[PDB]
Every structure is written in C-alpha cells, then in structure tokens.
Design a protein around this ligand. Structure first.
Ligand SMILES: O=Cc1ccc2cccc(O)c2n1
Ligand SMILES: [Cl-]
Ligand SMILES: [Cl-]
Ligand SMILES: [Cl-]
Length: 281
C-alpha cells in the first residue's frame, strides 16, 4: 500500500539542487544559492561535533554521501554511513572511493538498530522522522553507548508541536495542521512520525546527554521549500512524464503546504546537539 507512494530518484532530481540534498538548507549569508546553502547546512552540523583528525564520524541516513565527503575533506576523519537505499549505498561507495585520503570510508546498507561499532561522533540529518515514537529510547541509548566519554551527536529533524501546544493557536489551525501532518506521514514519508522538539530533547536527557537550546531552522526551510516548489513547478511537464500528474500534484501540495505551515509556525525544524558528560567545554 505504501509502495504505491515509492517515487524514482529521477523525480527528486527535478526540484532538488545538484547535490540532491533532501533536507533544510542553511542560507547564511542570506543570498547563498540552494546548492551553497546545502553545503552551509552540512558545515553547521559538522562544526558542532568537535571533530579532530583520525576520529570516526557515523552518519545515520548518509543520503548521497555529501556530509561524509565534506567531513573527510574538512576534518580528516574516518566515516561510516548508514542508509536503507541501494542506490544511495552505490552512489556513496563511489563518492567515498573518489576522495584522495588514507582515512577509512565505509557505507552500510542497514539501520542504526544493526550498528554497534565504537565511533567518536554521530550526525543524523532528517532521517529521525523515519524511525518511530517507541524506538526513541533505544536510539539515544545506542548513540550514547557507542561514543567515547567526549562524544557528541547532532540530529536535524522536522518537528510538530504536541496537540496541546497546537490548540493554543486555536482549534481551527490545529485540526487543519494535524490532517496535513497525516498527509506527509501517509503519502510523502509513508509510516513516518514527526517528533516534537521536546521529545528529541527529553529522550536525549533520559539517555544521559547534555542538550543545549536546540537551533530552529524554520526560516531556512521556508526559503528551501519555496525554491523546491518554484523549481518543481518550472519542471512540471518533465516531472509528469517521469512519474504522473498524480505524483507532481502530491509533491507540489507537500512543498507549498510545508512552506505555508512553517510560515504559520505550526511546523518547526530543530538541530539538536547531544553532549556526553565528558564532552569538551
Ligand atoms: O548517476 C546518477 C546520479 C545518482 C545519484 C546522484 C547524487 C548526486 C548527484 C548526482 O549527479 C547523482 N547522479
Ligand atoms: Cl519515496
Ligand atoms: Cl530521495
Ligand atoms: Cl547498545
């Protein structure tokens, strides 16, 4: 049933930047191109992890390998990537083999559940919404236990508010936003579940992590979703013939919809840092 919502990588290519990054860009400075801003977002994440030469970085949901490659090139670190996409696995192996380094580069076709190797630092960019509510305790325990005393993790995730907080903005918008979230979790990311920032923070604390004030990327996702929407819209004919009018309509609704609800502050995007007790000052 969810398989009906499986879409070819070719489609995403028609609205994403050349890196094919499927997550919030970081427009600092404001007038970066989408491509440059996707690199700036990778740097935002990596710059919080206190990476030193010879450390191993684990990337949970390593995508097309852009984060891992930047990490090797900027920080001279070993990398391990986890992905569930064969196509992403293939791309990543070739991206990493392409790098002129002596550092260990490994990509694994598996989830974090199956990963139990010591690593120094963890990065996870918009993979966490594709886990499940009941999995969050196990995820933070795993991350805590596989890292040394000075371990750090960043998790970037799209975020909803608890029904109670949404009701604070009036019942009309709340029920309306609840149904749009349902649509995303059914047809865009089937079986997904949007966490709250509060959940991301408190599950981290329960596992023993120090969690500073999460960074909001709301304004950067608005700009990202606007460019994605405009780009998909300009490639409508091309997009339709690669999939269907059904799929184009679905994704235009997704992109225009998120832009709207991010603007109305019924959705957020959180970059949460998790510091182990022995993390550097
Ligand atoms: O060969 C096709 C292909 C597949 C994945 C990609 C990811 C990022 C950039 C690219 O050009 C890609 N090209
Ligand atoms: Cl899909
Ligand atoms: Cl994709
Ligand atoms: Cl464990």
């Amino acid at each position: 049933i969810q398989a009906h919502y499986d879409v070819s990588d070719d489609f995403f290519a028609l609205f994403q930047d050349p890196t094919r990054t499927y997550s919030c860009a970081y427009f600092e400075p404001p007038e970066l191109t989408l491509e440059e801003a996707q690199y700036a977002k990778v740097d935002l994440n990596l710059d919080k992890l206190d990476l030193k030469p010879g450390m191993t970085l684990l990337d949970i949901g390593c995508g097309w390998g852009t984060t891992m490659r930047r990490a090797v090139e900027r920080f001279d670190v070993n990398v391990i990537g986890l992905t569930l996409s064969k196509n992403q696995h293939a791309r990543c192996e070739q991206v990493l083999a392409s790098i002129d380094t002596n550092r260990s580069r490994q990509v694994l076709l598996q989830g974090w559940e199956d990963f139990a190797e010591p690593v120094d630092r963890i990065v996870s960019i918009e993979a966490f919404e594709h886990f499940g509510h009941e999995n969050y305790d196990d995820f933070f325990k795993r991350c805590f236990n596989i890292m040394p005393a000075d371990g750090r993790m960043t998790v970037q995730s799209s975020v909803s508010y608890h029904p109670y907080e949404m009701a604070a903005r009036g019942k009309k918008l709340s029920f309306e936003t609840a149904r749009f979230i349902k649509f995303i979790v059914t047809e865009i990311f089937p079986g997904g579940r949007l966490p709250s920032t509060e959940m991301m923070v408190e599950h981290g604390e329960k596992a023993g992590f120090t969690v500073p004030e999460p960074l909001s990327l709301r304004p950067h996702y608005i700009k990202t979703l606007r460019i994605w929407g405009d780009t998909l819209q300009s490639n409508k004919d091309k997009a339709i013939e690669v999939t269907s009018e059904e799929v184009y309509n679905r994704y235009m609704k997704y992109l225009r919809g998120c832009e709207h609800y991010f603007t109305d502050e019924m959705l957020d995007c959180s970059l949460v840092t998790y510091l182990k007790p022995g993390a550097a000052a």
